[PDB]
Design an enzyme around this catalytic site. Structure first.
Site, PDB file in Angstrom:
ATOM      1  N   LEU A   1     -17.005 -10.671   5.396  1.00  0.00           N
ATOM      2  CA  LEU A   1     -17.558 -10.922   4.078  1.00  0.00           C
ATOM      3  C   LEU A   1     -16.512 -11.357   3.045  1.00  0.00           C
ATOM      4  CD1 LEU A   1     -20.178  -8.081   4.086  1.00  0.00           C
ATOM      5  CD2 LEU A   1     -20.300 -10.449   4.837  1.00  0.00           C
TER       6      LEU A   1
ATOM      7  N   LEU B   1      -8.292  -7.028  -0.670  1.00  0.00           N
ATOM      8  CA  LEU B   1      -6.963  -6.751  -1.191  1.00  0.00           C
ATOM      9  C   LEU B   1      -6.754  -7.563  -2.454  1.00  0.00           C
ATOM     10  CD1 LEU B   1      -4.054  -5.663  -1.061  1.00  0.00           C
ATOM     11  CD2 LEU B   1      -3.492  -7.649   0.292  1.00  0.00           C
ATOM     12  N   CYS B   2      -6.379  -6.899  -3.528  1.00  0.00           N
ATOM     13  CA  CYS B   2      -6.285  -7.590  -4.807  1.00  0.00           C
ATOM     14  C   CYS B   2      -5.342  -6.859  -5.748  1.00  0.00           C
ATOM     15  CB  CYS B   2      -7.669  -7.685  -5.433  1.00  0.00           C
ATOM     16  SG  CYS B   2      -7.671  -8.504  -6.994  1.00  0.00           S
ATOM     17  N   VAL B   3      -4.370  -7.589  -6.317  1.00  0.00           N
ATOM     18  CA  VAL B   3      -3.447  -7.057  -7.322  1.00  0.00           C
ATOM     19  C   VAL B   3      -3.644  -7.840  -8.608  1.00  0.00           C
ATOM     20  CG1 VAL B   3      -1.024  -6.924  -8.138  1.00  0.00           C
ATOM     21  CG2 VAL B   3      -1.649  -6.211  -5.781  1.00  0.00           C
TER      22      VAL B   3
ATOM     23  N   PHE C   1       8.308  -6.879   4.597  1.00  0.00           N
ATOM     24  CA  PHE C   1       7.315  -5.863   4.911  1.00  0.00           C
ATOM     25  C   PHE C   1       6.730  -6.056   6.309  1.00  0.00           C
ATOM     26  CE2 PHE C   1       2.840  -4.633   4.942  1.00  0.00           C
ATOM     27  CZ  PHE C   1       3.030  -3.274   4.977  1.00  0.00           C
ATOM     28  N   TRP C   2       6.158  -7.223   6.588  1.00  0.00           N
ATOM     29  CA  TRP C   2       5.507  -7.420   7.867  1.00  0.00           C
ATOM     30  C   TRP C   2       6.461  -7.354   9.043  1.00  0.00           C
ATOM     31  CZ3 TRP C   2       0.772  -6.591   8.638  1.00  0.00           C
ATOM     32  CH2 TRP C   2      -0.164  -6.751   7.593  1.00  0.00           C
TER      33      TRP C   2
ATOM     34  N   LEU D   1       3.620  -4.448  -4.839  1.00  0.00           N
ATOM     35  CA  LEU D   1       2.479  -3.547  -4.904  1.00  0.00           C
ATOM     36  C   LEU D   1       1.595  -3.654  -3.656  1.00  0.00           C
ATOM     37  CD1 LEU D   1       2.290  -1.701  -7.224  1.00  0.00           C
ATOM     38  CD2 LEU D   1       0.929  -3.375  -8.482  1.00  0.00           C
TER      39      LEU D   1
ATOM     40  N   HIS E   1      10.205 -11.843   6.126  1.00  0.00           N
ATOM     41  CA  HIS E   1       9.084 -10.919   5.890  1.00  0.00           C
ATOM     42  C   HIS E   1       9.507  -9.444   5.789  1.00  0.00           C
ATOM     43  CE1 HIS E   1       5.897 -13.828   6.089  1.00  0.00           C
ATOM     44  NE2 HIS E   1       6.127 -14.164   7.347  1.00  0.00           N
TER      45      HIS E   1
HETATM   46  C1  MYA Z   1      -4.759   1.293  11.363  1.00  0.00           C
HETATM   47  C2  MYA Z   1      -5.228   0.846   9.996  1.00  0.00           C
HETATM   48  C3  MYA Z   1      -4.424  -0.297   9.445  1.00  0.00           C
HETATM   49  C4  MYA Z   1      -4.787  -0.667   8.030  1.00  0.00           C
HETATM   50  C5  MYA Z   1      -3.987  -1.814   7.488  1.00  0.00           C
HETATM   51  C6  MYA Z   1      -4.238  -3.122   8.192  1.00  0.00           C
HETATM   52  C7  MYA Z   1      -3.498  -4.307   7.608  1.00  0.00           C
HETATM   53  C8  MYA Z   1      -4.203  -4.967   6.434  1.00  0.00           C
HETATM   54  C9  MYA Z   1      -3.369  -5.998   5.696  1.00  0.00           C
HETATM   55  C10 MYA Z   1      -4.029  -6.636   4.481  1.00  0.00           C
HETATM   56  C11 MYA Z   1      -5.224  -7.513   4.798  1.00  0.00           C
HETATM   57  C12 MYA Z   1      -5.894  -8.096   3.571  1.00  0.00           C
HETATM   58  C13 MYA Z   1      -6.916  -9.155   3.865  1.00  0.00           C
HETATM   59  C14 MYA Z   1      -7.484  -9.715   2.588  1.00  0.00           C
HETATM   60  O1  MYA Z   1      -8.179  -9.061   1.850  1.00  0.00           O
HETATM   61  S1  MYA Z   1      -7.070 -11.405   2.232  1.00  0.00           S
HETATM   62  C15 MYA Z   1      -7.296 -11.909   0.499  1.00  0.00           C
HETATM   63  C16 MYA Z   1      -6.170 -11.376  -0.373  1.00  0.00           C
HETATM   64  N1  MYA Z   1      -6.410 -11.577  -1.791  1.00  0.00           N
HETATM   65  C17 MYA Z   1      -5.920 -12.562  -2.566  1.00  0.00           C
HETATM   66  O2  MYA Z   1      -5.260 -13.501  -2.130  1.00  0.00           O
HETATM   67  C18 MYA Z   1      -6.226 -12.420  -4.042  1.00  0.00           C
HETATM   68  C19 MYA Z   1      -5.211 -13.073  -4.950  1.00  0.00           C
HETATM   69  N2  MYA Z   1      -3.858 -12.627  -4.657  1.00  0.00           N
HETATM   70  C20 MYA Z   1      -3.456 -11.387  -4.896  1.00  0.00           C
HETATM   71  O3  MYA Z   1      -4.190 -10.541  -5.400  1.00  0.00           O
HETATM   72  C21 MYA Z   1      -2.024 -11.016  -4.567  1.00  0.00           C
HETATM   73  O4  MYA Z   1      -1.207 -12.171  -4.541  1.00  0.00           O
HETATM   74  C22 MYA Z   1      -1.870 -10.288  -3.229  1.00  0.00           C
HETATM   75  C23 MYA Z   1      -2.495  -8.897  -3.350  1.00  0.00           C
HETATM   76  C24 MYA Z   1      -2.637 -11.054  -2.148  1.00  0.00           C
HETATM   77  C25 MYA Z   1      -0.401 -10.166  -2.812  1.00  0.00           C
HETATM   78  O5  MYA Z   1       0.322  -9.463  -3.849  1.00  0.00           O
HETATM   79  P1  MYA Z   1       1.578 -10.157  -4.566  1.00  0.00           P
HETATM   80  O6  MYA Z   1       1.346 -11.626  -4.574  1.00  0.00           O
HETATM   81  O7  MYA Z   1       1.761  -9.413  -5.843  1.00  0.00           O
HETATM   82  O8  MYA Z   1       2.781  -9.797  -3.558  1.00  0.00           O
HETATM   83  P2  MYA Z   1       3.560  -8.403  -3.430  1.00  0.00           P
HETATM   84  O9  MYA Z   1       4.919  -8.483  -4.047  1.00  0.00           O
HETATM   85  O10 MYA Z   1       2.642  -7.329  -3.928  1.00  0.00           O
HETATM   86  O11 MYA Z   1       3.695  -8.264  -1.846  1.00  0.00           O
HETATM   87  C26 MYA Z   1       4.358  -9.297  -1.084  1.00  0.00           C
HETATM   88  C27 MYA Z   1       4.064  -9.064   0.380  1.00  0.00           C
HETATM   89  O12 MYA Z   1       2.626  -9.184   0.572  1.00  0.00           O
HETATM   90  C28 MYA Z   1       2.370  -9.999   1.691  1.00  0.00           C
HETATM   91  N3  MYA Z   1       1.068 -10.625   1.516  1.00  0.00           N
HETATM   92  C29 MYA Z   1       0.731 -11.611   0.626  1.00  0.00           C
HETATM   93  N4  MYA Z   1      -0.518 -11.989   0.712  1.00  0.00           N
HETATM   94  C30 MYA Z   1      -1.047 -11.181   1.707  1.00  0.00           C
HETATM   95  C31 MYA Z   1      -2.340 -11.087   2.255  1.00  0.00           C
HETATM   96  N5  MYA Z   1      -3.352 -11.848   1.855  1.00  0.00           N
HETATM   97  N6  MYA Z   1      -2.549 -10.176   3.238  1.00  0.00           N
HETATM   98  C32 MYA Z   1      -1.511  -9.420   3.629  1.00  0.00           C
HETATM   99  N7  MYA Z   1      -0.254  -9.419   3.190  1.00  0.00           N
HETATM  100  C33 MYA Z   1      -0.081 -10.338   2.217  1.00  0.00           C
HETATM  101  C34 MYA Z   1       3.546 -10.970   1.715  1.00  0.00           C
HETATM  102  O13 MYA Z   1       3.707 -11.566   2.982  1.00  0.00           O
HETATM  103  C35 MYA Z   1       4.704 -10.036   1.355  1.00  0.00           C
HETATM  104  O14 MYA Z   1       5.122  -9.362   2.556  1.00  0.00           O
HETATM  105  P3  MYA Z   1       6.462  -9.953   3.253  1.00  0.00           P
HETATM  106  O15 MYA Z   1       6.363 -11.444   3.336  1.00  0.00           O
HETATM  107  O16 MYA Z   1       7.576  -9.495   2.335  1.00  0.00           O
HETATM  108  O17 MYA Z   1       6.519  -9.313   4.630  1.00  0.00           O
END
Ligand code: MYA
Length: 410
Positions: A410, A158-160, A3-4, A169, A1
């Site tokens: 939601l 969250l959506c790309v 990033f995480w 991204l 991971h």
């Molecule tokens: C103090 C305030 C804090 C604020 C922030 C609080 C945290 C909020 C966090 C977010 C809460 C959101 C809650 C919701 O809305 S959950 C619903 C999310 N939406 C979807 O699944 C829609 C369809 N999919 C996509 O749009 C893309 O595949 C997404 C955008 C999901 C990933 O884009 P892509 O596929 O192009 O990948 P990458 O190359 O850009 O990035 C790869 C990295 O992303 C990590 N990844 C993948 N899926 C998720 C996920 N669902 N939550 C968190 N992280 C996720 C993954 O482990 C990897 O990190 P690591 O494995 O290398 O470590």
């Protein structure tokens, strides 16, 4: 991971299992310590804060999610959150517009990515039972330290863009969202996901109550269970099994209206304070989240002798049926908040199902939070193949059962 592993979240299950007190992960910081400028990105991309009071902007977000947001593993269904829904979900009272974070293409201003934060007031202190285990060790002081509700960020959507997937991204979005929340002097967030990330404090399975089984089988959302094949007309008997009364059984059931807001806020907050993790709602937020709204949120009360004694709400999210031959949309209702004082929960939720069915919904969906698990069998809900995982950002929290979660996302 890659990033995480860098973020202030518990990094493994063996580590979350060994947590016994609620509290932060990171040492204190101030707004001063957080960069003022938005984070840099590709030369052809710019950050964009949408204006949610403008239908053009809402429309652009709607199109991005409609075509690119969550699909099931078979790519047969995709959320099609409506514009009215998005304005409801993203603009509760006191929402912060700068928490709505987008990337668009400079050249044509095309929306390419999104993530939304809204504020919520959440009880998130040590769970009751871990507190009992603590009072026994004289550690009651630490266990109770963070018992007062906290104003935190709730992340969603969250959506790309499909055509930009796997270019890191989403981590830049997550980081830029964290930055803007931190500059606001907020340090915690709550979020959910259907996928396993580091590291959930709760997980609940999805459950579905069939309302229009013929359509659900036609679009391959559901199938005919094998034991119906002993019938001459299995589909007829399946429909009979799922058949509902034509109108509610509870007399006194009526739509919610604004005058109901303080009594609904009373009974809801009595029910919700029962649970370890749950929101705290003012009259304004009760009003915003529960008052009926066409095609979006539906809320009914039981009035017995002039007083509101019970209520339920559900919200609507259709899903695009991906290249189907007879159907464009699955019309799904989602159990929202509710409260029962005068009748068993399953009698109250049975009226939710009757209402949803009369308003044309195909299926009633829920996650086993609140007391949803306890009526699954009484009301012929089927178990689904997905789970919803609850996460905190920058908050260490003991593992808990989903039936101790009271925050509906939601
Ligand atoms: C103090 C305030 C804090 C604020 C922030 C609080 C945290 C909020 C966090 C977010 C809460 C959101 C809650 C919701 O809305 S959950 C619903 C999310 N939406 C979807 O699944 C829609 C369809 N999919 C996509 O749009 C893309 O595949 C997404 C955008 C999901 C990933 O884009 P892509 O596929 O192009 O990948 P990458 O190359 O850009 O990035 C790869 C990295 O992303 C990590 N990844 C993948 N899926 C998720 C996920 N669902 N939550 C968190 N992280 C996720 C993954 O482990 C990897 O990190 P690591 O494995 O290398 O470590």
């Amino acid at each position: 991971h890659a990033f995480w592993s860098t973020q202030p979240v518990p990094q493994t299950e063996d580590e979350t299992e060994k947590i016994v007190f609620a509290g932060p992960m990171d040492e204190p910081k101030t707004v001063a310590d957080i960069p003022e400028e938005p984070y840099p990105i590709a030369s052809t991309f710019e950050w964009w804060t949408p204006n949610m009071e403008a239908a053009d902007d809402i429309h652009a977000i709607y199109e991005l999610l409609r075509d690119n947001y969550v699909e099931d593993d078979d790519s047969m269904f995709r959320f099609n959150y409506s514009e009215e829904f998005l304005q409801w979900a993203l603009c509760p009272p006191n929402y912060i517009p700068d928490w709505h974070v987008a990337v668009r293409r400079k050249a044509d201003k095309k929306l390419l990515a999104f993530i939304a934060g809204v504020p919520v007031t959440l009880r998130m202190g040590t769970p009751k039972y871990m507190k009992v285990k603590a009072q026994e060790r004289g550690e009651g002081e630490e266990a109770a330290k963070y018992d007062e509700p906290r104003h935190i960020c709730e992340i969603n959507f969250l959506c790309v863009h499909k055509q930009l997937r796997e270019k890191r991204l989403a981590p830049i979005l997550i980081k830029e969202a964290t930055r803007r929340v931190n500059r606001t002097n907020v340090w915690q967030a709550v979020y959910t996901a259907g996928v396993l990330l580091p590291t959930p404090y709760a997980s609940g399975q999805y459950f579905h109550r069939s309302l229009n089984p013929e359509k659900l089988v036609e679009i391959r959302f559901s199938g005919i269970p094998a034991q119906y094949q002993k019938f001459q007309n299995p589909m007829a008997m399946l429909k009979r099994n799922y058949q509902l009364p034509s109108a509610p059984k509870n007399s006194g059931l009526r739509e919610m209206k604004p005058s109901d807001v303080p009594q609904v806020r009373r009974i809801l907050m009595n029910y919700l304070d029962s649970f370890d993790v749950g929101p705290v709602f003012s009259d304004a937020e009760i009003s915003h989240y529960l008052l009926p709204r066409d095609g979006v949120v539906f809320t009914y009360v039981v009035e017995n002798d002039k007083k509101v004694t019970d209520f339920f709400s559900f919200y609507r999210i259709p899903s695009t049926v991906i290249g189907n031959s007879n159907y464009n949309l699955l019309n799904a209702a989602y159990v929202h908040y509710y409260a029962a004082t005068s009748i068993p929960l399953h009698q109250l939720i049975l009226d939710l199902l009757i209402v949803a069915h009369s308003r044309g919904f195909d299926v009633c969906n829920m996650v086993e939070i609140l007391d949803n698990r306890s009526f699954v069998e009484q009301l012929k809900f089927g178990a689904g193949d997905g789970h919803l995982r609850y996460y905190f950002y920058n908050w260490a929290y003991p593992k808990i059962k989903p039936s101790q979660v009271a925050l509906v996302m939601l």
